[PDB]
Amino acid sequence: VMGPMLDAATRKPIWRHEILDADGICSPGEKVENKQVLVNKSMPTVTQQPQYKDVPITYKGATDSYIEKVMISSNAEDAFLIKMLLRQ
Amino acid sequence: GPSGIVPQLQNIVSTVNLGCKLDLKTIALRARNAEYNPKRFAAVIMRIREPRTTALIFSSGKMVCTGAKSEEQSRLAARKYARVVQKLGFPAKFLDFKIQNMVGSCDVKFPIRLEGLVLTHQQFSSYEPELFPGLIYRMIKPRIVLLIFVSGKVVLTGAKVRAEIYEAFENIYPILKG
Amino acid sequence: QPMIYICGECHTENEIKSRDPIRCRECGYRIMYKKRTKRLVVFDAR
Amino acid sequence: INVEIKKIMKANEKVTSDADPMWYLKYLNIYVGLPDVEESFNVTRPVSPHECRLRDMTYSAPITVDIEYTRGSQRIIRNALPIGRMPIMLRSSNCVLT
Amino acid sequence: RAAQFDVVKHMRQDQITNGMVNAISTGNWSLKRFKMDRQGVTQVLSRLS
Amino acid sequence: RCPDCGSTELVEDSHYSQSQLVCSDCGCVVTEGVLTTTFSDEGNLREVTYSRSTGENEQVSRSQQRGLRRVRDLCRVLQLPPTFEDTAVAYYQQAYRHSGIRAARLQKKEVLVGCCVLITCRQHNWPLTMGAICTLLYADLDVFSSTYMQIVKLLGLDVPSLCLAELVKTYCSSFKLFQASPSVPAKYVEDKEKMLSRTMQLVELANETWLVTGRHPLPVITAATFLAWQSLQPADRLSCSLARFCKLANVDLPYPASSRLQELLAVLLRMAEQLAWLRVLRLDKRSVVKHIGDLLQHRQSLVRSAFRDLLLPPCMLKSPKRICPVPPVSTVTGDENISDSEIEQYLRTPQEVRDFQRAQA
Ligand SMILES: [Zn+2]
Ligand SMILES: [Zn+2]
C-alpha cells in the first residue's frame, strides 16, 4: 500500500485520495463519499524489476458513510488483514 | 600494512606425466616404500621422508605428490620419485610438471565476531556453526577459498603460488579488522 | 513521524512502520486499531 | 465428545499389515483437549471465541491419541501424538465460556 | 528397505481437519458408506435481532 | 489523444451506470460501454494449470512424482500452512532440472527433499533444528549435511541465519514443567513468561559474552533454562541435578551440556566479582544461584567494565607466549640431485622380493 500521492499544484492529495492517512489507509471518524478509495493497494505483475499495477478498494454507494473503526491483524500465513466498519 | 604475520604454506600439490607404461604389481614388489591394494584401489602409493611427502604412481604414466611446504620442495620430491621409478627399470621421464594446489594459514591475534562478517558478507561468506565451527568465505581475486575462525586464525586454499595467498591475505585483512 | 496504533487490551501505543508481524510489544496480542483522525469534521444538529 | 469418540476408537482399536505379519498397530486411548491457536513458531495459546470471529480463524481444539506399534521391537509407545483438530460448539463442556 | 520402518513418519494431519472443517462450512455430508448425499444441513446464524 | 482536439486530457469516467472515456478538455466521448462476465457462470468456473494447458506435467518421472509426493507429505505432517508446501515443491522442481541431481541415488533425493523444506522454513524465519528433520528422514546426518552444502553451493541461494530468539521461543514451549501433572511434583511449576524472560536474558548474556559463536546452541540453551529454573526458587532446586532435570522434563540432554554449563558458571563468577556486595560475600559456583536476577538487572554496565579486563576459546587462552612462529626458510631444491643412495634405500633386495611374493600367498 502506497501513501496518497500529493498534487504538485495545491500541495495536497488529489481528490480521490482525500481521506487516506499518511500510511495509505482511511482515518476513523472521517466522512467517505462515493468513488473515493479506502485502501490504496497495488500488487506486482508477476502473475527486471516486477512492475506493480494498482487495484484500489473503492467505496461505492448512493450515500456518504462515516468510518467508525479500522483494525489490522496478521494470520499465521503472514497475510495482512484489514477490516473497516462504516456507519450511516 | 601487515600485522607482522606472513601466511605460512602447509601443503603443496604437484603432478607430472611419466611418459611410459608401468606395472603397479612390479613397483609394489620392487620398492620398499610402495603400497599397493587393488582390491580397494588400483594405484601404488609412495612415501619419502625428505621432502616429507606422499605420492601416487599409476600404470598410465602419471604421478601425484603432496605434503611439501614449498613448490620447489614438491618438485624435488617428485623428481626423487621419478629417479626411484627410473632405477626400478621403468623408462619414465619428467614431462609436463604442474602445480595444482597449495594450502596456507595465518592469524590476526584478535577475536572474530563472525556474525557481523556473515551479516555484511552473506553473499560470499557462507557461515554455518552447527555442523562446522569455522566460517567459509570464497573470494574471486584470485579464485581462493578461505576458512575463518573466532580465535583469529585463517586457512587459505585453492592457490597456485604464494603470491596469491599473500594477496588474498592482504585483501581480507582490512575486512578482518573491520 | 511513524503511525501509532492501539493494541487490543492494554491500549498502549504501538508502532510498526515496517513489514513486521502485527504483535503488541507488551502482551502477545495481535490485533491493532488506527488512532482517531487528526482533522476536524462538521456535523448538522438535526 | 465424552463417550462416542471412545466407542468409535474401541470399535476400530487395532490394525495390521497382511504383508510380513507379526507387525501390528494398536490404539489405547483418545482425547480432545481444549481450544487453542497455532502460533507461527510452533507454540500455542488459548483463544476466546470473539478473537476468532475478528481474525476470520476457526475455533477448534486438538485431538490426541496414545499409540502402540511395533518396529523390530514391540516396546515403542507414544503418549501425546496429535491426529487432527475438532471444532468446538460454544458453551459446551470444553468451551472457554462455560 | 530391509531396515524396519515406523508408521510415525506417515501420521497425516490435514485429512481429518479438512474432512471436518469443510464439511461444516459447505453444508453437505456425502458418505459412501450409506451412499447418502445430504444438503442444507447447516445455516448461518441470523443476527437481525 | 482526443480526435476532436488532439489533447491528452482524457479521463475515464462513469455516469450512473455507463462506463466511458471522455475528453475532459472538450467533452467528447471516445470509448463507452463494456462487456463483462456474469454471476450465473461464476459457479461454473474451473481452472487448468498453465503447465497442464501447455501440455506439461506428463514428463514427471515416477521417481519425480514420488519425490514431490514426499515433499508434500513431509510438509504436511508438521501442520505447516500450505504456502510452505507450495514454495518447497517449487524449490524441489527447480532443483530437479540439473542432470547431476536427477542422476543420484534414493537417499540423495530424500535428503534433497529434507534440505529443501529446511531452506524454505528458514526463508520464513521459522526456527527448526536440523536434528529433528534428520530424525524424520531415513538417511543419516552426515550425508544430510553433505548434500545440504552441495545444493546450497550449486544453487547459491540465500541462507538466512538461524535466530536464537525464535529457537528459544519454540524450544521452551516443548517442556512439561508448567502443568501439575501427576508424574511431577507441584513444587516445580512456575509462570511461563517469567521463565521465558529469565532464559531470554541469560541467552543474550551468553551471546554477548562470545559463548555462542561457532558451537551448538541447544546445549547452552538447555543449561540456561536449567539455571533459570533453579534461580526462580533456589531454596530446593539447588539440590536438583541437570540429569534429574532432563528426566523430569523428558528431554535428551546433549553431551556437552555440562561443559557449556561450566563455562557459563565461570563467566558468572567473573561477573559476580564486579559487584560490591557479591565480591565482599565471597560467593561460589553453587551459592551464586540466588543472585542471577540481581546480576541481570545491572548486566550491561558491569559486563562492559568486565570486558576491559573478552572471551575466546578457553583451549587457546592458556597464555601462548609463541603464536604462529615463522619456520626456517628451506626453499632450496638443490641443483639436480642432492643424493642417490636414497633410491638404493627405497628398493628391495631379491631376498625381500621373494619374501614379498611369499607374503600374501
Ligand atoms: Zn498489547
Ligand atoms: Zn477534445
Number of residues in chain D:
98
For chain B, the C-alpha Rg in angstroms (whole number) is: 20
Experimental determination technique: cryo-EM
Q: Return the SS3 of F201.
A: helix
Extract the C-alpha cell encoding F232. 526462580
Q: At what angle do helices F106-123 and F82-95 cross, to 10 degrees?
A: 130
**Spatial distance between the Cα atoms of F113 and B115, rounded to a whole number of angstroms:** 28
For chain C, the C-alpha Rg in angstroms (whole number) is: 14
For an interface test with D, the pick among A70, A72, A75 (most D C-beta atoms closer than 10 Å) comes out as A75
Q: Return the SS3 of A25.
A: strand
Q: At what angle do helices F217-231 and F257-272 cross, to 10 degrees?
A: 60
Name the DSSP letter for residue C46.
-
Residues 6+ apart with CB under 8 A from E46: none
Work out the minimum CA distance from F199 to partner chain B, whole angstroms: 21
**Spatial distance between the Cα atoms of F121 and F80, rounded to a whole number of angstroms:** 9
CB contact under 8 A, D41 and F79: no
* Cα of D46 from ligand 1 centre, angstroms: 16
Extract the C-alpha cell encoding A86. 462504516
Name the DSSP letter for residue A39.
E
CB contact under 8 A, D72 and E4: yes
Strand ranges, E, within chain F: 10-14, 19-23, 29-32
**Spatial distance between the Cα atoms of F114 and F95, rounded to a whole number of angstroms:** 13
* Cα of A83 from ligand 1 centre, angstroms: 19
**Spatial distance between the Cα atoms of E27 and E17, rounded to a whole number of angstroms:** 15
CATH of the domain at F85: 1.10.472.10
* Cα of C23 from ligand 1 centre, angstroms: 8
Neighbours of F35 (CB within 10 A): 4
* Chain F residues bordering chain D (beta-carbon distance below 8 Å): 79, 126-127, 166, 169-170, 173
**Spatial distance between the Cα atoms of D64 and D83, rounded to a whole number of angstroms:** 6
Comparing CB atoms, the residue among A29, A31, A74 nearest residue C30 is: A74
Longest dimension (CA), chain D: 52
CB contact under 8 A, D45 and C28: yes
Residue F131: which domain range?
Answer: 54-155
Q: Return the H-helix or E-strand segment holding D8.
A: helix D4-11
Residue C26: which domain range?
Answer: 3-46
Does residue D67 contact residue D60 with C-beta atoms inside 8 Å?
no
Q: Return the SS3 of F92.
A: helix
Assign residue F74 a region: left if phi > 0, alpha if psi is -120 to 50, beta otherwise? Answer: alpha
Which one, of D90, D93, D35, lies nearest residue D60 by Cα? D35
Residues 6+ apart with CB under 8 A from F89: F68, F71, F72
* Chain B residues near residue F326 by CB distance under 8 angstroms: 6, 8
* A22 interface with C at CB cutoff 8 Å: yes
CATH of the domain at C21: 2.20.28.30
CA within 13 Å, CB half, F244: 10
* E2 interface with D at CB cutoff 8 Å: no
Inter-chain contacts counted by CB atoms under 8 A, chains A and C:
45
Residues 6+ apart with CB under 8 A from B14: B64, B65, B66, B68, B71, B74, B75, B78, B97, B98, B99, B100
**Spatial distance between the Cα atoms of B94 and B71, rounded to a whole number of angstroms:** 16
Pairing of strands C4-7, C13-15: antiparallel
Which one, of B133, C1, E36, lies nearest residue F212 by Cα? B133
Q: What angle do CA F345, F348, F352 make, to 5 degrees?
A: 135
For an interface test with D, the pick among A71, A73, A80, A85 (most D C-beta atoms closer than 10 Å) comes out as A73
Q: Return the SS3 of B116.
A: helix
Does residue F11 contact residue F22 with C-beta atoms inside 8 Å?
yes
* D54 interface with C at CB cutoff 8 Å: yes
Work out the minimum CA distance from D73 to partner chain E, whole angstroms: 10
Which one, of F172, F164, F168, lies nearest residue F213 by Cα? F164
Extract the C-alpha cell encoding B145. 577459498
Extract the C-alpha cell encoding A25. 489507509
Distances (CA, A) of B47 to B14, B27, F357: 14, 13, 21
CB contact under 8 A, F173 and D44: yes
Report CA F278 to chain centroid distance, whole Å.
Answer: 38
**Spatial distance between the Cα atoms of D46 and D35, rounded to a whole number of angstroms:** 6
Q: Is there a binding annotation on residue B40? A: no
Extract the C-alpha cell encoding A64. 456518504
Which residues of E, range 7-36, sit inside 8 Å of D by Cβ?
7-8, 11, 13, 15-17, 20-21, 24
Name the β-bridge partners of B137: B125, B146
Name the β-bridge partners of A25: A39
Q: Return the SS3 of A30.
A: coil
**Spatial distance between the Cα atoms of F67 and F137, rounded to a whole number of angstroms:** 13
Rounded to 5 degrees, φ, ψ at C33 are -135, 145
CB contact under 8 A, E21 and D25: no
* F192 interface with B at CB cutoff 8 Å: no
Q: Return the H-helix or E-strand segment holding B8.
A: strand B8-17
**Spatial distance between the Cα atoms of F43 and B58, rounded to a whole number of angstroms:** 74
Pairing of strands B62-66, B8-17: antiparallel
Ligand nearest to the CA of F27: 2
Residues 6+ apart with CB under 8 A from B143: B158
**Spatial distance between the Cα atoms of F165 and F168, rounded to a whole number of angstroms:** 5
Extract the C-alpha cell encoding C28. 502477545
To one decimal place, what's the resolution in Å? 3.5
Pairing of strands B35-37, D77-87: unpaired
Question: Cis before residue B142, ω within 30 degrees of 0?
Answer: yes
Does residue B156 contact residue B106 with C-beta atoms inside 8 Å?
yes
Where chain A is discontinuous (C–N > 2.5 Å), the residues before each break are 47
- DSSP assignment of E27-40 equals TB--BTTTTB--B-
**Spatial distance between the Cα atoms of B6 and F240, rounded to a whole number of angstroms:** 52
Q: What angle do CA B63, F100, B155 make, to 5 degrees?
A: 55
